[PDB]
């Protein structure tokens, strides 16, 4: 999409990530796991629900069929002209308001992902390289405590910086 | 290196076959969606506030109020939640002539 | 029939919370707004890509 992450530089989704819309897959010595980014999923959920509510909260109140005699053909045509006139407006509004917001929502999600990936890249700097498909290979040893530190955004950068310097120089 | 542990960033996928239209694209499969459009009915006329409609049947407003003899099922009518004319509603004025401002009367009666 | 509804149209009763219906323009009670569409579905989730 617009931010080239979803169906973009991250080629596919994770059917194995039940807990949220965006998150992390880790691999260390201890094993493999998934984890949702609770905070950004939450921001998204709130954003999207609010969007949905606005489109709907707007719409409100109005049809009460009328009759006319054989000498009232002009006011009858006007009544129909009115009824059809509003019906097309309201139909157009609705259909197009939905086409527009769908486009925007899929881009929103796309942005959220790109932004999540960038938040990590930002923390890790040169302590890990980018190996594509939204993956970060660590120059150092990252246990379960170190992974959690990435996901809650409180990763201690210099802590592992010295161990990571000496690994880029050689292997 | 040496272990080269990996973290990756990704998104939800599921076995949803719900599809939406965007402006740039049609039939996009999405993980979740909301239907905004009701298209089901129960094919019957029902009560409102627990009061049955008035079924004029073969009669029409005119035959009803005037008391066309085909409308005797209507003689005891007193309350209703709305009025139904069927597309068989032919019995109106039996002796022929103009019902003056009839359309206006219909309007008055619809409240 | 002896059913109850909060919204009635000449084709039948509607028993629903949605903002729109395409059943009939004429309604009695509390009804969704009539439109001519056959589809108004709003994305909430993301593009669903279950694999490579």
């Amino acid at each position, epitope marked *: 999409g617009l931010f080239g992450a979803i169906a973009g530089f991250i080629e596919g989704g994770w059917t194995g990530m039940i807990d*949220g*819309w965006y998150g992390y897959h880790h691999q260390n010595e201890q094993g493999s796991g998934y984890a949702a980014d609770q905070k950004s999923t*939450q921001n998204a959920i709130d954003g999207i629900t609010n969007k949905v*509510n606005s489109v709907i909260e707007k719409m409100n109140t109005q049809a009460v069929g009328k009759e006319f005699n054989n000498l009232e053909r002009r006011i009858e045509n006007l009544n129909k002209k009115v009824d059809d006139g509003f019906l097309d407006i309201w139909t157009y509004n609705a259909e197009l308001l939905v086409l527009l917001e769908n486009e925007r929502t899929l881009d929103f999600h796309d942005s959220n992902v790109r932004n999540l990936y960038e938040k990590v890249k930002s923390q890790l700097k040169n302590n890990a390289k980018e190996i594509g498909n939204g993956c970060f290979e660590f120059y150092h040893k990252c246990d379960d405590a170190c992974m959690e530190s990435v996901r809650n955004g409180t990763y201690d950068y210099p802590k592992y910086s010295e161990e990571s310097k000496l690994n880029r120089e050689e292997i | 290196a040496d272990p080269g542990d990996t973290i990756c960033i990704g998104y939800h996928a599921n076995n949803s076959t719900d599809t939406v239209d965007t402006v740039l694209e049609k039939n996009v499969t999405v993980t979740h969606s*909301v239907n905004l459009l*009701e298209d089901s009915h129960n094919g019957k006329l029902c009560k409102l506030k627990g009061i049955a409609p008035l079924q004029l049947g073969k009669c029409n407003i005119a035959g009803w109020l005037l008391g066309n003899p085909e409308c005797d099922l209507l003689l005891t009518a007193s309350s209703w939640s709305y009025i139904v004319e069927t597309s068989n509603s032919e019995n109106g004025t039996c002796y022929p002539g103009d019902f003056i401002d009839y359309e206006e009367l219909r309007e008055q009666l619809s409240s | 029939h002896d059913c109850n509804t909060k919204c009635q149209t000449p084709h039948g009763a509607i028993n629903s919370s949605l903002p729109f219906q395409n059943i009939h323009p004429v309604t009695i009670g509390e009804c969704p707004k009539y439109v001519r569409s056959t589809k108004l579905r709003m994305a*909430t989730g993301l593009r669903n890509i279950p694999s490579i």
Partner: antibody
Amino acid sequence: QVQLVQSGGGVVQPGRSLRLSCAASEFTFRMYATHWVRQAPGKGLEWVALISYDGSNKYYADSVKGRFTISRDNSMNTVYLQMNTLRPEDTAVYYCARDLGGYFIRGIMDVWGQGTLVTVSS
Amino acid sequence: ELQMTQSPSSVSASVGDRVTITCRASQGISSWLAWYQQKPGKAPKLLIYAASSLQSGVPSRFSGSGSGTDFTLTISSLQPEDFATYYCQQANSFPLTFGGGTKVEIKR
């Protein structure tokens, strides 16, 4: 924003059954899970049950389980708590609360109903 | 059999006072703990979830902290509208569990 209007409180006899309602004023409700919580007179809050946004699942306390069934009617935008083997210790005011996350259950209750009193006694 | 305990059962305080309530869980529940406020005869309000995240409506007077087994809610400067009962609640596992409540009362 969301008002949850609760319905179906009442006086009932132990053994005999009762059904509770939680109807949301706002369309988006059908995207959230729903909790039921209760409060015995003068007492603390006790979690009772949850149902996800589809009805997919579906969770209960131990205090009650195999006596209460939670269900959901997303088209009518309402949620139901069916209570069968009622017992004097189930007397309480009952609250439904919307979940903070659902589509993703988070187990926290962010919008509450007014609460509905149920009295189990003979 | 998760058991949430709240301490103390009451506190009396002047408006302006810093009140601090604790809540202890019988086993480790990570940081998945929420605080609610309930005035009598009304529904509870959410204040804090995930140990320390403030919920959007809530004045920042409110502040949660803790991890694993021990948790505290702190009201920095009790306002008149803060006299009510406060319940903690674990969101680690089902069934969900409420502490037993801490009433905070005016001190005249």
